[PDB]
Amino acid sequence: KDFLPLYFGWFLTKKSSETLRKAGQVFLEELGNHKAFKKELRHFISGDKEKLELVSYFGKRPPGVLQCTTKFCDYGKAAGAEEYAQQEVVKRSYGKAFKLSISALFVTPKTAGAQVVLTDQELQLWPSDEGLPPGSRAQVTLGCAADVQPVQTGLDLLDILQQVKGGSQGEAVGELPRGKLYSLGKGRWMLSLTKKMEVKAIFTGYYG
């Protein structure tokens, strides 16, 4: 038996990764500057030379190219890993190029990320291990706070998408070049892009 990757996912191309990463940074710089954000600072961090630099706050960022993870396998140790990797669709798609659609950027006290909206064919690659449809958790992580783990970004996203589903999104508290800014409370923020970003990526396995 040959062992599996650390994980499967869509790995963005150099160009797409650079584009998204840069858009992510601009958003953190813009957000940290926004009046509506500075007002809610107490809900973002507990601690207290007045401005918070969000780029600094999300002090852990992906070292290489950005990526959208499907199944964490831990070389076969993760539950369902073998079952996921044995699927025809996974084996067929391995090394194939895809286009991912980014619909929004979001920030919480724990993570910063980009929401990915998967096509139906891409959803075939989403593992099957709430009231939101499958694949809602899909995202690209842009940054995390010092003690936060990668799995958190997907959780943060779902929590945001639930707030939207319930109509607690609210009126846009601002307008950024790329879209409307929304305050969901508890340090949560979302930029709904006027125009969805398309990024190119390759579906494959990372071995560490």
DSSP string, 87-130: -HHHHHHTT-EEEEEEEEEEE-SSEEEEEEE--HHHHTTS----
d(CA 125, CA 89): 7
* Technique used: X-ray
Helix (H/G/I), strand (E/B), else coil: 81: helix
Q: Confirm if 100 and 68 have CB atoms less than 8 A apart.
A: yes
User: What span, in angstroms and rounded, lies between the C-alpha atoms of 192 and 201?
Assistant: 22
**Which two structure tokens, joined as six digits, stand for 172?**
């846009």
The SS3 call for residue 187 is coil
Q: Whole-angstrom distance between the N-terminal and C-terminal Cα of the chain? A: 19
Contacts of 130 (CB under 8 A, 6+ apart): 158, 162
Measured in degrees and rounded to the nearest 5, phi and psi for residue 112 equal -125, 135
Report the distance separating Cα 159 and Cα 165, nearest Å: 10
Q: After which residues is the chain broken (C to N over 2.5 A)?
A: 48, 129
Q: What residues does 69 pair with on adjacent strands? A: 9
Q: Which is the CATH superfamily of the domain at 1-208?
A: 2',3'-cyclic nucleotide 3'-phosphodiesterase superfamily (3.90.1740.10)
This structure's resolution (angstroms)? 2.0
Q: How many residues does the chain have?
A: 208
